[PDB]
């Protein structure tokens, strides 16, 4: 609906994707149809980005949440600096948080069980404040993203 561009819905999307990457799906009937569609598209993107940046990312030690946040913020600012917003770019946001959580898993100095919740949070912050208006104008997640990316 029109309110799926508010923080709570986006946070759940971001958390859902990291739980998928980390292989800890939470109990219940499963995620929303939005999350289910997003998870395949974002993971396909994640694998391609990991491949195309292997050398670059191997030279970055993501040793803390603060390092992950600062890097996320810098990459996002550069990615969106031309003012353009579209669904492909929004998908890459989810792919990048999956990359960060995988590097944190190998390099975080002080792991905490809630790390993926902290990452999901500042990811949702960025999506809402920097793309939320565009998302809403283009049908939101249910009437925009899912309609375009779900199977035909």
């Amino acid at each position: 609906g029109m309110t799926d561009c508010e923080f709570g819905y986006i946070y759940r999307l971001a958390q859902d994707y990291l739980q998928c990457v980390l292989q800890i799906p939470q109990p219940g009937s499963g995620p929303s149809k939005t999350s289910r569609v997003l998870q395949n598209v974002a993971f396909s993107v994640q694998k391609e980005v990991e491949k195309n940046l292997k050398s670059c990312l191997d030279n970055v030690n993501v040793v803390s949440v603060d390092t992950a946040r600062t890097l996320f913020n810098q990459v996002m600012e550069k990615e969106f600096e031309d003012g353009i917003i579209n669904w492909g770019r929004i998908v890459t946001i989810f792919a990048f948080e999956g990359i960060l959580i995988k590097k944190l898993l190998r390099q975080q100095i002080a792991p905490d069980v809630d790390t993926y919740k902290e990452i999901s949070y500042f990811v949702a912050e960025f999506i809402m404040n920097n793309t939320g208006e565009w998302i809403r104008q283009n049908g939101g997640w249910e009437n925009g993203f899912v309609k375009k990316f779900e199977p035909k």
Binding site: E48, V49, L53, L57, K78, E79, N86, W87, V91, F149
Partner: peptide
Amino acid sequence: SYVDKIADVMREVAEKINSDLT
């Protein structure tokens, strides 16, 4: 900046996603 290299790949993959829908 090393950030630019990451962002460039992100921009490129994003537009491939948009075009690959068709």
